[PDB]
Amino acid sequence: GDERFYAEHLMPTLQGLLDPESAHRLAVRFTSLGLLPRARFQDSDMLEVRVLGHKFRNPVGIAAGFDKHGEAVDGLYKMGFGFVEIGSVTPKPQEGNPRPRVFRLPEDQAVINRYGFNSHGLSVVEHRLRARQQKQAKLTEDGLPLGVNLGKNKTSVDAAEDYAEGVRVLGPLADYLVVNVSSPNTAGLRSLQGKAELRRLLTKVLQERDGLRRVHRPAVLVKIAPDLTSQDKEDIASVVKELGIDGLIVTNTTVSRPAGLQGALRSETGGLSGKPLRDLSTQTIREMYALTQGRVPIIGVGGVSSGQDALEKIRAGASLVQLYTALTFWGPPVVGKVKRELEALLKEQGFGGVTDAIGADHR
């Protein structure tokens, strides 16, 4: 009902009137103000997942980058997301790259962005989250956890200290933290995915995390690129198991440009998201699940806009999934759509619930 209206009329009209960055800002504002109908979909028990030390009422989250500064968290839960991830947040405020820096590829159901970690900074986000900290504690108890995605400043000399500062400041306010070493839009950042740098970096992050008081001690996940070599992936899996990293987010956007893209803006610099990333992401999930023997929780992300997309990532090894780009095309109704379709497919394929389907392709 609302799905068709948003998909065929409202969203195409917003896109026709507004450049993508302006449209994004409007979306965040409307969401923050709750200017959206409370999702009518009631989450069934078979969508519940217990992972990362928490209950998730459903496995569909909002990916990092939509609410970079923690301004729309409650509105995103109202939209029906089972968990919310904000960020990336950098230690100091920074403006990001010059405009234009976001591009729609409607023929490909894709987006290219080169925002460059535009961030209000840790202090501002800290105070935003503190203003609703007890509300979030209740939401988390009720199965709606909060993740905080940490980045590094453009002019930072010591990347590990940037992430450490993020752990110290926002760790106490998060159910999980994400060490984002896979943005394609910060020079040198992805090199932090290399084995030696990654081990040093994550050792420091986990030390800082372990130093927080117990009820303020988050899970720590690493978010990785879809563009890794086989060697890169082996090394990451090894470091993650060695250090006891709590999970992986798989994947960030791709700097590849798959054959067949039709969008006029396909050769813009930046990370590509949406459908052209979908199966690249799913295969990266599949590989990382195998390399970690299924013992390391994966949040699967990239090109999800249907129950089938979600279930493919879950069967490949994901315990949870996220989406972003689908929102920009389908609007808020896509969340209920994915959940309804996912429940139906689980039933069709003989799964008792999401948990039974995690990694099922490997078995």
Ligand X SMILES: Cc1cc2nc3c(=O)[nH]c(=O)nc-3n(C[C@H](O)[C@H](O)[C@H](O)COP(=O)(O)O)c2cc1C
Ligand Y SMILES: O=C(O)c1cc(=O)[nH]c(=O)[nH]1
Ligand Z SMILES: CCCCCCCCCCCC[N+](C)(C)[O-]
Ligand U SMILES: O=C1c2ccccc2C(=O)c2c1nnn2-c1cc(F)c(-c2cccc(CO)c2)c(F)c1
Least distance in Å: CB of 134 to ligand X? 27
- Give yes or no: 123 in active site: no
302 touches, from ligand Z, ligand X, ligand U, none (C-beta below 5 to 8 Å by class) = ligand X
Instruction: Considering the candidates 183, 273, 306, 319, report the single residue annotated as catalytic.
Output: 183
Is 63 an interacting residue with respect to ligand X (CB under 6 A)?
yes
Judged by beta carbon, residue 56 or residue 103, the one nearer ligand U is: 103
Minimum CB–partner distance for residue 19 and ligand U (Å):
8
Q: In this complex, which beta carbon is closest to ligand Y, that of residue 6 or of residue 115?
A: 115
| Residues 6 or more apart in contact with residue 303 via CB below 8 angstroms | 109, 273, 274, 275, 276, 277, 278, 279, 281, 309, 325, 326
Distance CA 225, CA 98 (A): 23
Q: Which residues pair with 301 in a beta bridge?
A: 322
Rank residues 116 and 247 by Cβ distance to ligand Y and give the closer one.
Answer: 116
Nearer to ligand Z, 272 or 288 (CB): 272
- Other CB atoms within 10 A of residue 280 CB: 18
Residues 319-348 vs ligand X: string with x where CB under 6 A? Answer: ----xxxx----------------------
Q: SS in 3 state form for 76-132?
A: HHHCCCCEEEEEEECCCCECCCCCCCEEEEHHHCEEEECCCCCECCHHHHHHHHHCC
Is 57 among the residues that bind ligand Z (CB under 6 A)? no
What is 265-287 written as a DSSP string?
TTTSSSEEEEGGGHHHHHHHHHH
Tokens of residue 7, six digits: 């998909």
Task: Tell me if 185 contacts ligand Y by CB under 6 A.
Answer: yes
Stretch that binds ligand Y, among 179-187, 298-306, 314-322, 341-349 (CB under 6 A): 179-187
For 61, 72, 113, 232, 345, the CA distances from 69, given in Å and listed in that order, are: 17, 8, 17, 30, 35
**Contact flags string 237-266 toward ligand Z, x per CB under 6 A:** ---------------------x--------
* DSSP-derived pairing of the beta strands 176-180 and 146-150: parallel
Contact between 255 and ligand U per CB under 6 A: no
Interface map 304-343 toward ligand U (x if CB under 6 A): -----------------------xx--xx-----------
Among 32-40, 45-53, 110-118, 333-341, the segment contacting ligand Y (CB under 6 A): 110-118
Does the annotation flag 115 for ligand binding?
A: yes
Report the C-alpha gap between 360 and 363 in whole angstroms: 5
88 near ligand Y, judged by CB under 6 A: yes
Q: Could you tell me the CA-to-CA distances from 87 to 62, 99, 170, 174, 197 in Å, in that order? A: 11, 20, 11, 12, 23
Residue 115 as a binder of ligand X (CB under 6 A): the answer is yes
Provide the β-strand partners of residue 219.
Answer: 176
Question: Nearest-CB residue to ligand X?
Answer: 65
What is d(CA 22, CA 299) in angstroms, rounded to the nearest whole number?
A: 29
Residue type, 198: L
- Out of 85, 108, 227, 287, the only residue in the binding site for ligand Z (CB under 6 A) is 108
User: How many chain residues touch ligand Y (CB under 6 A)?
Assistant: 13
Packing angle, helices 307-316 and 333-348, rounded to 10:
60
What are 86's two structure tokens?
Answer: 């904000």
User: Which x/- pattern over 224-263 shows residues binding ligand X (rule: CB under 6 A)?
Assistant: ----------------------------xx----------
Which residue has 């039709």 as its token pair?
262
Do residues 70 and 165 touch, judged by C-beta distance below 8 A? no
Write out the residues near ligand Z by the rule CB under 6 A. Answer: 108-109, 258, 275-276, 279
Write out the residues near ligand Y by the rule CB under 6 A. Answer: 65, 88, 113-117, 180, 183, 185, 252-253, 271
Q: Which residue numbers are catalytic?
A: 183
Write out the residues near ligand X by the rule CB under 6 A. Answer: 63-65, 68, 87-88, 102, 111, 113, 115, 149, 180, 183, 223, 252-253, 273-274, 277, 301-304, 323-326
Residues in binding site for substrate: 68, 113-117, 180-185, 252-253
